[PDB]
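Notes, p. 3: input format for complexes.
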Amino acid sequence: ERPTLPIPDLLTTDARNRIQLTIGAGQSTFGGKTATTWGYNGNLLGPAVKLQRGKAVTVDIYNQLTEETTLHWHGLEVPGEVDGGPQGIIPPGGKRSVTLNVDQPAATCWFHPHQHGKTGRQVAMGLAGLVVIEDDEILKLMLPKQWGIDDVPVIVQDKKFSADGQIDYQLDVMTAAVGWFGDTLLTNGAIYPQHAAPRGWLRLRLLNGCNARSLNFATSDNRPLYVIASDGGLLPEPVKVSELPVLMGERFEVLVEVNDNKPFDLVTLPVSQMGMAIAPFDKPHPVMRIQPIAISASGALPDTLSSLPALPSLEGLTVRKLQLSMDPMLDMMGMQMLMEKYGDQAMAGMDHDFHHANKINGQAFDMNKPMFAAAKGQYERWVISGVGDMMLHPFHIHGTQFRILSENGKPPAAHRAGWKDTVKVEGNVSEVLVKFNHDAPKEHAYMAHCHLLEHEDTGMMLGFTV
Ligand SMILES: [Cu+2]
Ligand SMILES: [Cu+2]
Ligand SMILES: [Cu+2]
Ligand SMILES: [Cu+2]
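Output follows (466 residues plus copper (II) ion):
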């Protein structure tokens, strides 16, 4: 029998209006071998912090690691001062407090470290948690809502381990070029778990929490997934798909049918990204087993979910151009190291100082020099180009949920046309329509970056003020 799917605790404020998060080192077991891991309020991963539109909460963050860290709320429209980018340092043994004044629609967001040059390692060690934002609108819908029963978070991540069982993380020329990736897949920290779901509808809140691996969800028997929400909240209507690509840092909420007595798997299908279709990910790979059970459920798939506003008019919008680049030497040397490791048949396309080698507008990230000041309270058009580069860059902008106008050469797919905080850039150009409602000064700037973490950590990031 498979281990049961772990369910993160749904964490709400105490009588002081406070939530306590302790960042700490402990131990986990994978494949019978123990490993040192890091977690929020535990050994690995983290709880699901529950927030309500229009209400404030205060979060007390205790760093019990022996190195500096920061805590970023990915997807939250909050001021730079509480955004927890690389300037939001928490000393070892210290505590920092932030007040979050939640003012955006219902969504599944998440949180993770953003330490300067070390974001990849700190996420690889185990640090990530969830954010469940609710509002009046969503609770009136007849969606599955029993946490841990028919409304289930699914945080999917790969790791690699050394022979002794420890997490094997390195920022080297190979991983700086293609990313940190591994041969072991985790689902809420467990290897191929099973979840017991009531007959009817099952709601999955999917997060790609990998450092560098893109994913593509589907089911083992080809039943459809009904997408109801993206990074920034509900779609206007459900969107039926047979497969669902999810980039690093993205979330989607789906409904799937659960019937009778026969179990089926959620799987991830092979992707085209360099390194990622190497065995065991050259075939459909199980994520988790879904076992039907005969207990109470009343969730439904509504005809209509939300209202989606018109895209803003393009006339007179400020245009900002962001050119992504990688040093051609890093591309050469990294790809060479990949073929040296795995050989020339490992996947398709293989047989025919790196610390500041990745850049935006010809500059590796400078924490002391924000690239520009964006306007407050008005839409801008940002144009992000990966032309001249063949790698995949899921481009993430802090402090906002935006609308995708063009994604890598075409209008976005229907389930990607709502509220997003990430856009695909892969050898072509993308355009987003973006608005910042909150301030970010030089001392606590917003970041914009590729969310392939090893690219971020080796320079593919800029700061901006509002
Ligand atoms: Cu993030
Ligand atoms: Cu973010
Ligand atoms: Cu990148
Ligand atoms: Cu970031």
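Residues 391, 393, 450, 452, 455, 460 surround copper (II) ion (ligand 3) (CB under 6 Å).
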